[PDB]
Amino acid sequence: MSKVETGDQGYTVVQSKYKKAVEQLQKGLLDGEIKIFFEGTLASTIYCLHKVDNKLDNLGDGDYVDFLIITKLRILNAKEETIDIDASSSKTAQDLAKKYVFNKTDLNTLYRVLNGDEADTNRLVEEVSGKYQVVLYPEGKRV
Amino acid sequence: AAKASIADENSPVKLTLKSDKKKDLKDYVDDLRTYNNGYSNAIEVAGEDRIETAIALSQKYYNSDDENAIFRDSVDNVVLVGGNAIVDGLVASPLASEKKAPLLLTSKDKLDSSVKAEIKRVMNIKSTTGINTSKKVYLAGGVNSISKEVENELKDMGLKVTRLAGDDRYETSLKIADEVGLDNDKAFVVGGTGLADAMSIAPVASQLRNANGKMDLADGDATPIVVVDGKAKTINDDVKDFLDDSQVDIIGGENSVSKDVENAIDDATGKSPDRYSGDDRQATNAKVIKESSYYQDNLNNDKKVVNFFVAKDGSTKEDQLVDALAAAPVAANFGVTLNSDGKPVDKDGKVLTGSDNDKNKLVSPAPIVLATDSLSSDQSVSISKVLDKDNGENLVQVGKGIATSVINKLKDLLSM
Ligand code: NA
C-alpha cells in the first residue's frame, strides 16, 4: 500500500503548483525520507531537486509525478478549472456529468462530511478565502 | 490541500467547488452524484445502415476497454448474414452468443469493405494475405441472399467460411437452429411471418444458462429458435425430427402459429407447448419480460432484474428487427466484464478477488424491450415488478429510430 495510485488516501497537487509543495518538503527536514516517482518509475529516494524540477517543468498530457513523505502526494498535468456554483453561467451538475465522468464513492464521503454525519477531522471542507470549498477531480471525458 | 483520494493520471481538469454556505455545495454534490450515475448508466449504440449498427455493437462490447462490456479482448468467431436477408439468419442470435461472436451483415453480391475492416479489428487480424484459420465466419443464407463472390472474397483473406443455407427460408432456418443446438430440452418456435416474435425471444434465448435455469457464462448454453410453416395443417417432417423430447415455447399468436400447428407440436413433442402470446408483438414481448424464470430466477445475487435493453420492432418495414438480432447476444451477457481468461475484471482490467465478486453473482442479464414508436403498458408493469428495491443500473438502446419517449419512461421504471 506504500505506493501512490488513483484512489489512495493522500494529497493531490496540479503540476502548476508543485514548487510551493516541494518547498514545504525541504524545510521539513523530516518534520524536524522523500521518495519521488516519475509516472510510477523511480527517480529519487532522498541538484537532484532540479532534475525533479525539470520533469515537472516539461510534463505531458498523460504524465505524472508521485511523492511519499506516512504521507502520500501525487502531482499530475491536468488543467486548472474552478467553478463557483453560486454563480450563473456555470455548468450545472448535469452538464458537468454529461461532459465528465466522476467517482461516485468520493462524491459520497464528501456529502456525508458536508451533511454533518462525519466530523471534518481531515479538513475536507476548508474555510479558505471566506468561502467553503472542495476539490474534485474527474476520471475522464465522456465519449 | 486535504487528505483525500488522489486523482487519476488522465484526469482532464481539477475542479474546485466553492460556495458561501456549506449546505449549498452539499446540495450540488448530491445533484452531481445523481446525474453522474444516470449519464454513465444509459447508453445508445447504433450505426448509419444495418451493417454499421452491427459493427457498432461489436466495437463497444467485443475487444474493448469499456466497462460493462462483454469481452475485454479479441474474439475468434463472427456470424454473418445477408443485408436485407433478415430471414436468412433471423435465428442467428443464439448462435452468435454461443460462439462468443458478434453478428454482422453483408450485401448479396460483394463483400462490403466496412465489414472486411470490422472482421480484422474484432479478430485482431494481422495480415489479410496470410492465413487466419484460427478465425471462423458463418454465412447464414443461400446463394440468392449471400452470393458466391462474397464467400470467395472471404476465403481470399484466409478466413474459414461455413455456409448455413437451404432451398428456402424454412430449411436454412433449421440449419442455423441445428448449429445452435437443443442442449436444454427447451426450444422456441415461431411462424413463417413471426419475425417480430423471434426478436422478442432472442435475448433470453441467447442467455448462457445452467440446467437449473441459473446464469453461467463459462459453461451455460443458449436456446435455439425455429421458424415453421404456420399456414398449414400439420408440420414438416424436418421440423418434427429437430423438436424431439423438447419443452417447446411458442411465441406468437394463432395467425402465425395456428392451433393446428400447436397441436401438431403437442403431438410431436409429448408436452403441451407453453404459448407466450398477446394480441400483437408488443403484448407478446411484455409476457416475455414478465416471466419470472426468464430474467429473475436466473440470478445468483440477492437482487432482482437491474439491467435492460431496448430495440426496434418491425411494425413498419419488417427489416428493422435486424438490430435486435445483433443486440441479443450482448444483452444476454450483461453485468460483468470478462477477459480472455474468463475472469471478472474492473475498469482498469485487474481481476476481482473474494467470493462476493463471483462472475456468476455480478452478472445480471437484460431483456430487449421491443418498442419502435411506443411502449406498451403491459411491458411497463413487467419492468416495474422485476426491478430490485435498490433500483436499476444500466439501460442500453440499440439502433437508430427508437423514440426517446420510450427511453425516458424506461428510466423512470428503473429510476435512473
Ligand atoms: Na447449444
Numbering used by the authors:
A (entry chain A): 4 to 35, 39 to 52, 68 to 90, 243 to 316
B (entry chain B): 1 to 416
The paper states:
Of particular interest in this context, is the role of the S-layer in disease. This paracrystalline protein array is the outermost layer of the C. difficile cell envelope, with similar structures found in many bacteria and virtually all archaea. In C. difficile, the main component of the S-layer is SlpA, which is post-translationally cleaved by a cell wall protein (CWP), Cwp84, into two functional S-layer proteins (SLPs), SLPL and SLPH. Assembly of the paracrystalline array relies on tiling of SLPH triangular prisms on the cell wall, interlocked by SLPL ridges facing the environment. Strikingly, the lattice is very compact compared to other studied S-layers, which have pores of between 30–100 Å compared with only ~10 Å in diameter in C. difficile.
An insertion of five-nucleotides was observed in a second variant, FM2.5slpA249insCTTAG (subsequently referred to as FM2.5varB; 249-253insCTTAG), resulting in the modification of 13 amino acids within the mature protein. Although crystals were obtained for all strains, only SlpAvarB crystals were of sufficient quality for X-ray diffraction data collection and structural determination by molecular replacement, using previous SlpA structures as models. The 13 altered residues in α2L in SlpAvarB result in disruption of the α-helix secondary structure and introduce disorder in the upstream loop that links the preceding β-strand (β3L) and α2L. However, the relative orientation of these domains in the SlpAvarB molecule is altered, with D1 and the interacting domains rotated towards the SLPH plane by ~30 °. In the SlpAvarB structure, disruption of α2L and reorientation of D1 and LID/HID relative to SLPH leads to changes in the interactions between neighbouring molecules and, consequently, a rearrangement of the S-layer array. Unlike in the previously determined structures, neighbouring D1 domains in the SlpAvarB structure are too far apart to mediate contacts (> 12 Å). A new interacting interface between HID from one molecule and CWB23 from a neighbouring molecule occludes these gaps and stabilises the S-layer lattice. The absence of density to model D2 in SlpAvarB further illustrates that this domain is dispensable for S-layer assembly, as previously reported. The presence of a more intricate network of interactions and more extensive interface areas between neighbouring molecules seen in the SlpAvarB structure, when compared to the R20291-related SlpARΔD2 structure, suggests a potentially less flexible paracrystalline array.
